[PDB]
């Protein structure tokens, strides 16, 4: 058993970007990959998604990728590649839109998508056991602690509040929709 292609390619992309951040500085990578911060950048379509590929420290990237590997891994194995692509795109896009609306375009990380995945895997298991996917009891707890640490800013760092709430909402919404 191993991570399928979508789980993998997101992990490598995040590592490559993280490397480029270390060599170039975070600011140079943000100039290229951040949500449009000027009207001249509005048609550079990748920017609505690529904010998800940027991480600002070792612990930031590790925690983001650990959850992705587990939850993304589970979605891809049980529901296939296509579904993970769509969940990721929608959560990246929406989480990004809510975050910039709250606090402007300077943000990054995969935690919008992760909060979506947590919401999605959980609610799909609850509403639709015949799907073949669910969030195991123990991880429900650790996921629940993660969400609490987001709501109350317990991570010891500047938080993308809009990305987190929008991400969680989307995962729940997509689960609801798929469970019909």
């Amino acid at each position: 058993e191993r991570a399928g292609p979508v789980t993998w390619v997101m992990m490598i992309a995040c590592v490559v970007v993280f490397i480029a951040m270390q060599i170039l500085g975070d600011q140079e990578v943000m100039l290229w990959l951040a949500w449009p911060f000027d009207p001249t950048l509005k048609f550079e379509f990748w920017r609505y998604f690529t904010h998800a590929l940027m991480h600002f420290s070792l612990m930031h990237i590790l925690f983001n990728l650990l959850w992705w590997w587990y939850l993304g891994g589970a979605v891809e194995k049980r529901l296939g590649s296509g579904k993970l692509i769509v969940i990721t795109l929608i959560s990246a896009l929406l989480s990004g839109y809510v975050q910039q609306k709250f606090s402007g375009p300077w943000f990054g990380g995969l935690s919008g998508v992760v909060y979506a995945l947590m919401g999605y895997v959980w609610l799909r298991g609850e509403r639709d056991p015949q799907s073949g996917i669910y969030l195991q009891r123990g991880l429900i707890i650790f996921a629940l602690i993660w969400i609490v640490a987001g709501w109350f800013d317990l991570f010891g760092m500047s938080m993308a509040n809009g990305a987190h709430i929008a991400g969680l909402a989307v995962g729940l919404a997509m689960a609801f929709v798929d469970s019909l």
Binding site: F56, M157, M159
Partner: peptide, 5 residues
């Protein structure tokens, strides 16, 4: 500080 997602 940049916001962490």
């Amino acid at each position: 500080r940049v916001r962490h997602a």
